Amino acid sequence: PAPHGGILQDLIARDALKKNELLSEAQSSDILVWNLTPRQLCDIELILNGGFSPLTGFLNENDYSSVVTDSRLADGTLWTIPITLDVDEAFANQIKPDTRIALFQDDEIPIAILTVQDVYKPNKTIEAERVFRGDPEHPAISYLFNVAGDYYVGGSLEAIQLPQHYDYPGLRKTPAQLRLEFQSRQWDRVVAFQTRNPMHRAHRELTVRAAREANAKVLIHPVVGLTKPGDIDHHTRVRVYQEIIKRYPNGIAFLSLLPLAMRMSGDREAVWHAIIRKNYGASHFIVGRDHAGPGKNSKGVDFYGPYDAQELVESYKHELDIEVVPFRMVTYLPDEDRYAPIDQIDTTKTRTLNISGTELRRRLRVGGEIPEWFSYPEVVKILRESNPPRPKQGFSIVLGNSLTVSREQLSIALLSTFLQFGGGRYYKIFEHNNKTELLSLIQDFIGSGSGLIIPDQWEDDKDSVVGKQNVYLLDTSSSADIQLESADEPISHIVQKVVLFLEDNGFFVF
Amino acid sequence: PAPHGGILQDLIARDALKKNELLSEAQSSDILVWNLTPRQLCDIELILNGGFSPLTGFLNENDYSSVVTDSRLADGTLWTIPITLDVDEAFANQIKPDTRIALFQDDEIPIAILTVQDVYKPNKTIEAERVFRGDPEHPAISYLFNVAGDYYVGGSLEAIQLPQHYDYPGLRKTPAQLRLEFQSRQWDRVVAFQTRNPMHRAHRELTVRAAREANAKVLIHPVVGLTKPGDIDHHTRVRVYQEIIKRYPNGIAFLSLLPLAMRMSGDREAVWHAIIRKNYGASHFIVGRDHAGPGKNSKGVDFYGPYDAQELVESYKHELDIEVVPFRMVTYLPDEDRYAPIDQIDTTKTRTLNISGTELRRRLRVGGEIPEWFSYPEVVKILRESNPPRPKQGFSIVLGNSLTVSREQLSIALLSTFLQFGGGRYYKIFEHNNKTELLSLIQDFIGSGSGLIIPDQWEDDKDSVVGKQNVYLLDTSSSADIQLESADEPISHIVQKVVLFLEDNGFFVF
Ligand SMILES: Nc1ncnc2c1ncn2[C@@H]1O[C@H](COP(=O)(O)OS(=O)(=O)O)[C@@H](O)[C@H]1O
Ligand SMILES: Nc1ncnc2c1ncn2[C@@H]1O[C@H](COP(=O)(O)OS(=O)(=O)O)[C@@H](O)[C@H]1O
Ligand SMILES: [Ca+2]
Ligand SMILES: [Ca+2]
Ligand SMILES: [Ca+2]
Ligand SMILES: [Ca+2]
Ligand SMILES: [Ca+2]
Ligand SMILES: [Ca+2]
Ligand SMILES: [Mg+2]
Ligand SMILES: [Mg+2]
Ligand code: NA
Numbered sequence A, B: 001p002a003p004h005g006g007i008l009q010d011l012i013a014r015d016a017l018k019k020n021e022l023l024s025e026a027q028s029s030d031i032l033v034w035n036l037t038p039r040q041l042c043d044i045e046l047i048l049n050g051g052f053s054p055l056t057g058f059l060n061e062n063d064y065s066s067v068v069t070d071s072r073l074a075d076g077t078l079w080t081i082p083i084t085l086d087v088d089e090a091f092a093n094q095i096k097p098d099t100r101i102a103l104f105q106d107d108e109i110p111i112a113i114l115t116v117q118d119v120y121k122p123n124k125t126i127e128a129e130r131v132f133r134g135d136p137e138h139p140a141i142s143y144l145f146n147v148a149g150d151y152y153v154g155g156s157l158e159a160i161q162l163p164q165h166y167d168y169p170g171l172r173k174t175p176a177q178l179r180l181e182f183q184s185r186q187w188d189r190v191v192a193f194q195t196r197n198p199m200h201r202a203h204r205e206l207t208v209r210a211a212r213e214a215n216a217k218v219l220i221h222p223v224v225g226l227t228k229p230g231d232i233d234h235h236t237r238v239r240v241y242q243e244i245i246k247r248y249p250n251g252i253a254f255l256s257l258l259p260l261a262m263r264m265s266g267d268r269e270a271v272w273h274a275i276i277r278k279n280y281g282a283s284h285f286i287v288g289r290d291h292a293g294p295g296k297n298s299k300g301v302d303f304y305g306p307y308d309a310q311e312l313v314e315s316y317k318h319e320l321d322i323e324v325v326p327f328r329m330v331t332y333l334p335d336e337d338r339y340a341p342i343d344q345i346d347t348t349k350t351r352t353l354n355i356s357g358t359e360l361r362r363r364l365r366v367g368g369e370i371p372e373w374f375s376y377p378e379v380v381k382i383l384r385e386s387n388p389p390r391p392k393q394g395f396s397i398v399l400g401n402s403l404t405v406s407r408e409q410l411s412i413a414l415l416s417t418f419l420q421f422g423g424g425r426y427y428k429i430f431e432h433n434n435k436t437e438l439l440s441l442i443q444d445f446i447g448s449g450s451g452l453i454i455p456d457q458w459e460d461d462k463d464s465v466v467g468k469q470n471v472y473l474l475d476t477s478s479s480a481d482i483q484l485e486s487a488d489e490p491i492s493h494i495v496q497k498v499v500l501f502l503e504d505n506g507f508f509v510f
């Protein structure tokens, strides 16, 4: 289908002959420079390659507000997610319209030249409410208030080069490249499958059903740009995708990585995803249950209805110009050993089975055995390997402040005690001295599977520098993960409590 | 590197706007039509896509003879293998120079329009001797005298479309497409690996060593056009390649299928292969032991020296314009568990191991266990699956002419006897009635693993219609595979001889 807006805005192609010139300007000592934030690197790449057609830069206030309140660009073009260049007051103050800014990656690789149209201060509360539904726990809202700059810079782009990537060079196909891929294969019907999670059996069946329904080839188009916090890293997922793609009949599916930065904006994002997939050459786009939805908030309430996305996409059906293949909950049928859309069964006459993502991590963290019917063996192997069970996970024991015993001797005791257990885990007494360059290394070790014994707490002003993952506090306080009887409890006693606690949480298995 | 001759002769690209016109001419009732033979379909595809640059058609007598006696085109361009359009006297007589012939595939798909330059009758004996070294058992020579037409038609081509293929649509990359593939990946150094056999551990090591020596990425460029008779079909090999490619580090190798029709012309072919890979975008080409060699003849003598190809390629080194990575016998080192070029070991100080292709089939046909060191498990699995052991192979028992007993009763006896053995094999009394439409089906069944009991022989004039594979003759004659005592030997006796013969040859296992 024709790219959204009618013209694929591949600016790399467009500006080719200005490459050298733009590059010179980008590195001229006079031009103002802004180093792109991670999400911005994702967005900038989708803008320059045509993935965000008709966009050709970051939204000015006129187009931005029109998207917030109208799900459309100022000219009426259907567009639900605002793509803006967020900066800080300090930087915002150095620019005026007509100004040319050089956009860099890692304060080293010049990506593009942005010609300023305007500099405004968005009302983040409206964007949060109208665009992401207002809930403060929503991933896009939390980003908007805690990471995003408070000033947006609307302006047009001139491409120097797409952001740099050293992993999967062959797989990050651009819209132009994907289209050629499909053509060389004479693929004129292609249903695209969005995803940010590893694909299990349900998904494989879902995608094949779609290929059959639409009479089209399958395009696995996963997001490797930025997804929901806590998601499985993309490297692991790519390994999973490349593995599961082999379960499809020969020459029916194609894999391509999408460097998109999701907002987990349920229904709006679904519309957005469809527009993006259309730009990339897809003729069909799948939209299953809770598409692009971030689940429930701490109160247990849904951020979106399980089918809001489908409803929203349905209402823009006649102007999306890409056919949507909707799916209802796809579940497992024990008694028949096969999956099927929930909308064509039940009646109690048939029993179903479903292993939610939650329950999935549990087995992964507890060494549980994931059902042969749920996912392929090769896939679980890859997953377990990236997210090992507790007995192979790292951790830290922080000797609380209330501790009255010798921190030095208690540290040694714990070290010697853990050492006798064996199991391949590496241990270390870790003195941070409140130095962030040491604090920031704590999760690195934990990530490496090592066990750390930290004799002292770090000042509260630095608590943010350390990831709380698998970090336990040994203290007399009520907020201690491992609570002590008294501040001067004898070491052997404290040691037994720490050992049994870790044993109870699966870190040790005898 | 620059395509051989300086210009990539991608005629599909060149003639694009003449597509409709040429197609109309190709289907005009007045034009003369020739249906391309299989090998011609392979050649025609390599000429039209630029793989045979500078060629732009089938060699006229001038260029043809220059290649036979000079390993060069008339203009001096280095070219060792003659690419000609062979036809029969009947067809040759209907054409004169300046004539335009329509070249079809399956007497249905118009491939191109050939403009006649000349029609000559080559001296096949010279071509056989100067180009293929003369031995009558040489694959290219046997084809030249038993399959090829006795008349060649030199002339230029105008492409309508490359030959049709419904398998591996994405993998049969054209020179232009491969070059783009490499570029999108920023691959400026690529060492290509030719092959017509499944890749085992030795090859994987060989190719990686090459990647490391040349400091280049790996291109697995296997032949799926036409190879040595008796080779493993390409479908199986592709499955093997796709499987083994996964044993390479991520993003170091690329797979592309080459629809080439080999001539098994050792050294000359090596030169030719190098030219071909250069046209396809490779910067390096591997040339190991007995490259493109058909082994030995029935007398046990080599068609080519194990390193003739390397020597020939070496002598054209300065004009091939593509770097050749030569390899000496790569063998296995038990004591060190690793492979290595034979030129850098031996001295008896180290023991080697080598499982020749011969010995390889033996295990495959005998259910033997192929060593973990020799090939990957996943690969052998695929191989055994395509070339099952005797206990899963089909066969036929032909009741010889000398048979005096009731052919009807002996047939039933054999059927009832084989049936009691079980093992998944399907049996059938097969009456051919000397009808070729029935005879041509015999190998189909054997190929399907079934066991056939044929009560009568077929006239000698039709013996050619039947593949002799796993077809045994039960007769009193000395040329009988299963020799009987007397023409009227009692059935139960004949039955025991047949059963024990099949049991001795592994078809039955109890
Ligand atoms: N059980 C299911 N039934 C129907 N659709 C599903 C199911 N599981 C996942 N999907 C669909 O698969 C696509 C991607 O799934 P996920 O990676 O889990 O999440 S999403 O954030 O990319 O939407 C979405 O269209 C989603 O709705
Ligand atoms: N043991 C080996 N040592 C060195 N080179 C080898 C070895 N085996 C195969 N090769 C090389 O691998 C390439 C393809 O091998 P084959 O498929 O067996 O045959 S070929 O007809 O295509 O050459 C050739 O360059 C060949 O010489
Ligand atoms: Ca703020
Ligand atoms: Ca719910
Ligand atoms: Ca006390
Ligand atoms: Ca003849
Ligand atoms: Ca020899
Ligand atoms: Ca007798
Ligand atoms: Mg990039
Ligand atoms: Mg083809
Ligand atoms: Na369209």
Ligand code: NA
Binding pocket: A106, A107, A108
């Ligand atoms: Na730097």
Ligand code: NA
Binding pocket: A214, A323
């Ligand atoms: Na449809």
Ligand code: NA
Binding pocket: A304, A305, A308
């Ligand atoms: Na709803």
Ligand code: NA
Binding pocket: A318, A319, A320, A321
């Ligand atoms: Na439309």
Ligand code: NA
Binding pocket: A504
């Ligand atoms: Na507990």
Ligand code: NA
Binding pocket: B106, B107, B108
């Ligand atoms: Na026909």
Ligand code: NA
Binding pocket: B125, B129
């Ligand atoms: Na002679």
Ligand code: NA
Binding pocket: B323
């Ligand atoms: Na070199």
Ligand code: NA
Binding pocket: B304, B305, B308
């Ligand atoms: Na020789």
Ligand code: NA
Binding pocket: B001, B002, B321
């Ligand atoms: Na050169």
Ligand code: NA
Binding pocket: B504
């Ligand atoms: Na024997």
